[PDB]
Amino acid sequence: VGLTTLFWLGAIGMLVGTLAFAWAGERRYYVTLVGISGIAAVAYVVMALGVGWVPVAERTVFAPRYIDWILTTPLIVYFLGLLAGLDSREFGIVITLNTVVMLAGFAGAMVPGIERYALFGMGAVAFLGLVYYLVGPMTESASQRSSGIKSLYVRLRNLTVILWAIYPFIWLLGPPGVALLTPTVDVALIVYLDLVTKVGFGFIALDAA
């Protein structure tokens, strides 16, 4: 099982999700889910073709992964913000916090020296602030909606919080960090997480609709 095989698997999974969401497509929600998995599909194909594998010191960094995350994770937060009924100002805070996490990870991965752990730490701090907004203010806000919408928000929120919290550990234990986990295992774990936090996320929304 090679890296390219794992990338192709993620590509196929994202593509199936993309077509499923487009078919089922309230247009805003369905269009967002197409963007979430559609962008990831492209990133995985590019990586499957061997494009964007950047050598850094003694590790290999996958640049398309971080461009993907920077564009798709704010769309996931946007989806959750619509469910919770955020005003346009609360959106700005959480999307700003999200972008800090994603940019810090991208920069830390691309830096060869130990300064990269300083960048990782900053993303960790901003992530804790993002979790606070999901579990607190956004949950208060979602409470004002129908019982079914509130229930859907809580289920997507917990899926999001629990799984997103695993990524920094995979990053740190993998090549970008202490380089303990091997690239193949590290990639396999992230392909699984990407698929669940995007396509699984999406199908839980379809089921409730």
Ligand X SMILES: *C/C=C(C)/C=C/C=C(C)/C=C/C1=C(C)CCCC1(C)C
What residues line the site for ligand X (CB under 6 A)? Answer: 40, 69, 72-73, 101-102, 104-105, 120, 123-124, 127, 164, 167-168, 171, 194, 197-198
Nearer to ligand X, 164 or 192 (CB): 164
Q: In whole angstroms, how close is the CB of 109 to Cl ion at the nearest point? A: 5
Q: Would you give the DSSP letter of residue 179? A: -
Separation CA 80–CA 28 (nearest Å):
12
d(CA 45, CA 16): 13
168 binds, among ligand X, Cl ion, none (CB under 5 to 8 A by kind): ligand X
Least separation, in Å, of the C-beta of 195 and Cl ion?
17
Residue 62 near Cl ion by CB under 5 A:
yes
Among 190, 169, 201, 172, smallest CA distance to 77 is for: 201
Number of residues that bind Cl ion (CB under 5 A): 3
Q: Cβ closer to Cl ion: 109 or 130?
A: 109
Q: Which residue is nearest to ligand X (CB)?
A: 105
Site for Cl ion in 96-115 (CB under 5 A): 109
Query: What Rg, from alpha-carbon coordinates, does the chain have?
Result: 17
Should residue 61 be labelled a site residue for Cl ion when binding is judged by CB under 5 A? yes
CB half-sphere exposure, 34, CA atoms < 13 A = 12
Residue 21 vs 120, nearer CB to ligand X: 120
Nearer to Cl ion, 41 or 61 (CB): 61
Tell me which of ligand X, Cl ion, none is bound by residue 61, counting a contact when its beta carbon lies within the kind-specific cut-off of 5 to 8 angstroms.
Cl ion
Q: Which is nearer to ligand X, 30 or 201 (CB)?
A: 201
Contacts of 35 (CB under 8 A, 6+ apart): 71, 72, 75
Q: Which does residue 171 touch among Cl ion, ligand X, none (CB within 5 to 8 A, set by kind)?
A: ligand X
3-state helix, strand, coil in the chain (%, to 5): 80, 5, 15
Q: How is 106-139 classified by DSSP, letter by letter?
A: HHHHH--STHHHHHHHHHHHHHHHHHHHHHTHHH
What is the binding site for Cl ion (CB under 5 A)? Answer: 61-62, 109
